[PDB]
Design a protein around this ligand. Structure first.
Ligand SMILES: O=P(O)(O)C(F)(Cc1cnc2ccccn12)P(=O)(O)O
Ligand SMILES: O=P(O)(O)C(F)(Cc1cnc2ccccn12)P(=O)(O)O
Ligand SMILES: [Mg+2]
Ligand SMILES: [Mg+2]
Ligand SMILES: [Mg+2]
Ligand SMILES: [Mg+2]
Ligand SMILES: [Mg+2]
Ligand SMILES: [Mg+2]
Lengths: 337, 337
């Protein structure tokens, strides 16, 4: 329901940094603090908040002691660190300029490609926090394996993203709905909303294969919507709101936009896209955006967001039980705002 | 004792690739195969072999069935994948040219910074293999935590390496034996020879804190020698033998060589080093190498290798028991060849 819930979560960031950043390695620990502060804050915090809210909804308060509550927000901060690790690396590989309303970490003079190792440290912080706070719990190994498998799935999706988007090479024939759906399932659906709810389910003692699979049915589809919205906003969103500049056209990406464009384009329009996509020149990028506008892709996206919301609601009705519907409804509220 | 042991280990690489590389993600799995083939072979295989040899030495043959033996070489291949993950990233961050007798993976036209994700996939492969082959064993969680902690320690050391070696900035005052020893302990000693023997000890059921600490006393010192030898060879080794071109001078690194140089340099020689270190120009690099030769650093290294070997032998006498000395002696043989 709340942004009070969100402020409560964000208030724990200082404690997470503190415990991660306690003589010889001192200079390295300070750099770690600097990487956490720059890269783990400044977004919307929904993924990590979801662990806290879901956990509360799945466990009776007569079991939610101070230590249990702390484990929940710590694991929520683990999901945030996973996102941070991945975005630092992604921004390098995507040649991005800005993120979360500031220059990308690797663009800072003085950082550069050393951000590669800085990302690897954020990943390590997840397993440090799990050891510090969850090691005696019955779900500990489940949580470790969930984070590891989520990361491997995300990495497979990144591979697909990058292979389908070669620099210097036309790849329009590969830009199909079928390829699109596989890319986004792996690169986004597992780690965005499946991961945090699955984590909360484990923490609540819900470890059954069937209940995880039913939750997955809902949550992967939510994640696939989230990536389509991300692709729309790359070009049509306001960077003062999104906090980042889009690069998909210049990067030759298999975006939902280019897929939808190809589905509707005349042969003449196909040649316009072929001659202008996947190139650094601003005039060429502008020609693609004009094509997308001519083809009313912003309206196609509006219709898709309506159709998607209805579908996800129907999946909640099919697959939520025996979990409280509100577990999924509050996520849907935030995602489809 | 053997290179027959080594050939037996290397023969299992095809099986490791096969099991990692079994429809939608097909193109990504093929890229994975390509990354494994290019980056996980072509070195000396001592780290991974060590798991196999140590395991054999610590477990009675009446317990070494076909499945036990397979787990051992699989975990040895995990140590090799850890090395591969780290070297792919290191070569980017160090601006390296060649590795293992070929162009660095990220230097390949067509690869570039996409190697960032390729490295992250090699890391993931370690935990995939652990799950596939060790998940029902009593040491499984121990092995997972050992690989995770080793990786975090290595990453802290990489941080220190990179902070002490800023581009464009003189950092001679920081190049002290005390800083040197901290850098190499973290960036190399944990993951090179501690990790494989600790893994074999866990697999053998040797999980005691004291026995691990005693093994660590020997193995971290072996690793610190190995890094000093690596630093010597960066400049004095034959790339036809080492399989890589050195970059430490141009990269402004806190190498053992520059540390030893600073200890012996006159004020005049300090200014020569200050004016020439940490810069891309070949003529400047040549001036540093001439200084090191004038100061007889190759002889200082020869004397150090003798002194170090004797010290490591004395630590074997102090700390090996109750493990067979041969566990450490065979490592020392290979390292100090
Ligand atoms: O627009 P962003 O945030 O850069 C993006 F959504 C970031 C992103 C989505 N899924 C992943 C997975 C790993 C790393 C970054 N990811 P992308 O458009 O690059 O695909
Ligand atoms: O000479 P190499 O192999 O590049 C080196 F030994 C590689 C290396 C040693 N320790 C690590 C740890 C992580 C990654 C690479 N490592 P470096 O001289 O860069 O320090
Ligand atoms: Mg991106
Ligand atoms: Mg991307
Ligand atoms: Mg995007
Ligand atoms: Mg290097
Ligand atoms: Mg290095
Ligand atoms: Mg070196």
């Amino acid at each position: 329901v709340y942004a009070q819930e969100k402020q409560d979560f964000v208030q724990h960031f200082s404690q997470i940094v503190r415990v991660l950043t306690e003589p010889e390695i001192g200079d390295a620990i300070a750099r770690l603090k600097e990487v956490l502060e720059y890269n783990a804050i400044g977004g919307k915090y929904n993924r990590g908040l979801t662990v806290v809210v879901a956990f509360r909804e799945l466990v009776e308060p007569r079991k939610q002691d101070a230590d249990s509550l702390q484990r929940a927000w710590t694991v929520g901060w683990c999901v945030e660190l996973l996102q941070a690790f991945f975005l630092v690396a992604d921004d390098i590989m995507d040649s991005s300029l800005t993120r979360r309303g500031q220059i990308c970490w690797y663009q800072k003079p003085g950082v550069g490609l050393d951000a590669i190792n800085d990302a690897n440290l954020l990943e390590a912080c997840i397993y440090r926090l799990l050891k510090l706070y969850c090691r005696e719990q019955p779900y500990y190994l489940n949580l470790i394996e969930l984070f590891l498998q989520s990361s491997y799935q995300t990495e497979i999706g990144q591979t697909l993203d990058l292979l389908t988007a070669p620099q210097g090479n036309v790849d329009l024939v590969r830009f199909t709905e079928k390829r699109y759906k596989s890319i986004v399932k792996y690169k986004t659906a597992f780690y965005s909303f499946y991961l945090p709810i699955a984590a909360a389910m484990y923490m609540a003692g819900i470890d059954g294969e069937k209940e995880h699979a039913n939750a997955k049915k809902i949550l992967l589809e939510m994640g696939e919507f989230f990536q389509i919205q991300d692709d729309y906003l790359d070009l049509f969103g306001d960077p003062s709101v999104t906090g980042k500049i889009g690069t998909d056209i210049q990067d030759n990406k298999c975006s939902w936009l280019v897929v939808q464009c190809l589905q509707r384009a005349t042969p003449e329009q196909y040649q316009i896209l072929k001659e202008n996509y996947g190139q650094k020149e601003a005039e060429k990028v502008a020609r693609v955006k004009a094509l997308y506008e001519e083809l009313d892709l912003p309206a196609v996206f509006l219709q898709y967001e309506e159709d998607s919301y209805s579908h996800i609601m129907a999946l909640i009705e099919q697959y939520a039980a025996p979990l409280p519907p509100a577990v999924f409804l509050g996520l849907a509220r935030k995602i489809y705002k």
